[PDB]
Amino acid sequence: PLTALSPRRFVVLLIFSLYSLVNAFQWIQYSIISNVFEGFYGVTLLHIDWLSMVYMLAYVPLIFPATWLLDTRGLRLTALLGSGLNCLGAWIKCGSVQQHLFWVTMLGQCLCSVAQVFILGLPSRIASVWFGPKEVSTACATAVLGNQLGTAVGFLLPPVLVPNTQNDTNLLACNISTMFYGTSAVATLLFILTAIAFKEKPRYPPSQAQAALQDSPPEEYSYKKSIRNLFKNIPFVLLLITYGIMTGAFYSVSTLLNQMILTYYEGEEVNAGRIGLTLVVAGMVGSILCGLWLDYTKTYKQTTLIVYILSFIGMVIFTFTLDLRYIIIVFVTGGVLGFFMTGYLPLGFEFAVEITYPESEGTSSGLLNASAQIFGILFTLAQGKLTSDYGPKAGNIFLCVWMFIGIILTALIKS
Numbered sequence: 448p449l450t451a452l453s454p455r456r457f458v459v460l461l462i463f464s465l466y467s468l469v470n471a472f473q474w475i476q477y478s479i480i481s482n483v484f485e486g487f488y489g490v491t492l493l494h495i496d497w498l499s500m501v502y503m504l505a506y507v508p509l510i511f512p513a514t515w516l517l518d519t520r521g522l523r524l525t526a527l528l529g530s531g532l533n534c535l536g537a538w539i540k541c542g543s544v545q546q547h548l549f550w551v552t553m554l555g556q557c558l559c560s561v562a563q564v565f566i567l568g569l570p571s572r573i574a575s576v577w578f579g580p581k582e583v584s585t586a587c588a589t590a591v592l593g594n595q596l597g598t599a600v601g602f603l604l605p606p607v608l609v610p611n612t613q614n615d616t617n618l619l620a621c622n623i624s625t626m627f628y629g630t631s632a633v634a635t636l637l638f639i640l641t642a643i644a645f646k647e648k649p650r651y652p653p654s655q656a657q658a659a660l661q662d663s664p665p666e667e668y669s670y671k672k673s674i675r676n677l678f679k680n681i682p683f684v685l686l687l688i689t690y691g692i693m694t695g696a697f698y699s700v701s702t703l704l705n706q707m708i709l710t711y712y713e714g715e716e717v718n719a720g721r722i723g724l725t726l727v728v729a730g731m732v733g734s735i736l737c738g739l740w741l742d743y744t745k746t747y748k749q750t751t752l753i754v755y756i757l758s759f760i761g762m763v764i765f766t767f768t769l770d771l772r773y774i775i776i777v778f779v780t781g782g783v784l785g786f787f788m789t790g791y792l793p794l795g796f797e798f799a800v801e802i803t804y805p806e807s808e809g810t811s812s813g814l815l816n817a818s819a820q821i822f823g824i825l826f827t828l829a830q831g832k833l834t835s836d837y838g839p840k841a842g843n844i845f846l847c848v849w850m851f852i853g854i855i856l857t858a859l860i861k862s
């Protein structure tokens with residue numbers, strides 16, 4: 448066949464990497480300053496925990512219908528739906544600047560959650576469709592890095608944008624409205640860019656594989672059968688459990704970092720945001736380094752076990768060092784912990800893709816993400832309860848025990 452590369456692909460990626468960013472910024476914006484919103488709305492921290500967890504709750508059941516819609520309708524419809532849903536959720540958030548309108552913020556968060564189901568699975572498909580064989584890996588990696596950067600921006604900005612001025616309600620409302628207006632304007636702009644430039648497919652397949660895929664007639668795939676076949680493979684089940692445990696621990700830590708820091712350090716929301724940003728940035732660095740190191744080594748189990756062990760060590764040291772009352776210690780421990788845990792995720796995802804090579808990669812990715820969402824919900828609930836009742840240390844020890852169980856499971860994996 449005939450294959451060629453078009454410049455538009457870059458734009459198609461860039462816009463995505465932008466509107467996948469904003470969604471991430473909206474996932475944690477409430478959690479990082481959860482105390483401020485708790486004071487403003489007169490609600491409990493469980494409300495902010497649910498604001499964080501609605502992403503997982505919505506993603507869990509809608510992953511497979513979204514995959515079917517993407518496979519049948521195409522990429523353009525999925526991108527349009529994601530961008531429009533994100534923009535609409537932000538606009539709904541704009542109308543939630545009243546102390547008695549928490550439900551409006553909840554509705555906006557639900558809309559962003561529904562957008563996430565379309566947003567999350569895009570990277571691999573966009574990279575395959577629009578980029579060549581020597582750039583597909585780079586395109587997917589930079590898309591995931593854009594999502595991670597959005598998470599980091601959500602960690603960093605809100606603490607500074609909205610100071611905890613509980614004394615005056617007008618100033619807090621003004622700051623919240625300003626943040627919501629900025630986010631909604633950015634989301635609407637990115638939706639306009641997606642509607643204008645996000646083409647369904649390039650004129651020529653970027654690579655021979657994409658040309659063959661286009662030439663080959665579409666064939667229906669039974670997602671239920673694929674899931675049933677995948678569940679048979681015990682090693683895949685173990686890898687799924689371990690990846691879910693790791694991702695859920697990361698999500699719970701991200702959600703409850705504000706509470707953990709506020710328990711010991713008072714009036715340090717900006718420092719908490721900086722700690723989260725350092726954690727996520729070190730996570731990206733570790734992800735890149737681990738990906739390249741895995742590509743060079745060709746070993747999929749020893750690296751996974753070592754990374755899991757180091758992540759558990761980081762979690763334990765963070766737990767036993769957070770109470771020392773030194774912010775530098777918290778910065779360092781969070782940085783190393785995030786490095787290890789966030790670098791684990793790409794390794795586990797690639798291992799799952801490789802081990803299940805006969806099976807469809809999309810179904811495996813969807814199952815991995817669903818397990819991560821469920822584990823994150825459970826871990827966030829348990830750790831929040833423990834922190835509220837017994838303090839951060841109890842929930843941190845619970846997470847450490849879960850990480851040790853994950854190490855055991857990873858050791859039991861065979862391949």
Ligand SMILES: CC(C)CCC[C@@H](C)[C@H]1CC[C@H]2[C@@H]3CC=C4C[C@@H](OC(=O)CCC(=O)O)CC[C@]4(C)[C@H]3CC[C@]12C
Nearest residue numbers: 507508509510511512670671674687691817818819821
């Ligand atoms: C990781 C462990 C602890 C939990 C794993 C749970 C999964 C087995 C769940 C999570 C999401 C579920 C899915 C959520 C939504 C749907 C769509 C649903 O669609 C229909 O009702 C029509 C299907 C058809 O077209 O035949 C079918 C079941 C399915 C795939 C579910 C099958 C079971 C899944 C994969």
Ligand SMILES: CC(C)CCC[C@@H](C)[C@H]1CC[C@H]2[C@@H]3CC=C4C[C@@H](OC(=O)CCC(=O)O)CC[C@]4(C)[C@H]3CC[C@]12C
Nearest residue numbers: 491493494497498501502504505553556557558560561
């Ligand atoms: C559209 C899709 C994404 C699903 C949307 C589901 C949410 C709207 C639901 C799921 C779980 C619900 C929460 C489950 C439990 C609680 C605790 C509940 O707390 C109490 O009743 C006691 C409060 C106190 O301690 O004073 C308040 C409602 C809330 C936050 C619920 C609010 C609505 C939530 C977030």
Ligand SMILES: CC(C)CCC[C@@H](C)[C@H]1CC[C@H]2[C@@H]3CC=C4C[C@@H](OC(=O)CCC(=O)O)CC[C@]4(C)[C@H]3CC[C@]12C
Nearest residue numbers: 829833836837838840841842843844845846848849852
């Ligand atoms: C695989 C799953 C099912 C394991 C679940 C285990 C949990 C039930 C464990 C994990 C961490 C434990 C907690 C770790 C630390 C403490 C502090 C402990 O504090 C005390 O009152 C005694 C010690 C002291 O004096 O400080 C009370 C029990 C508690 C909350 C533990 C209760 C039981 C927990 C939640």
Ligand SMILES: C[N+](C)(C)CCO
Nearest residue numbers: 471474502503598698
């Ligand atoms: C993918 N996020 C980290 C943005 C949300 C998880 O529920």
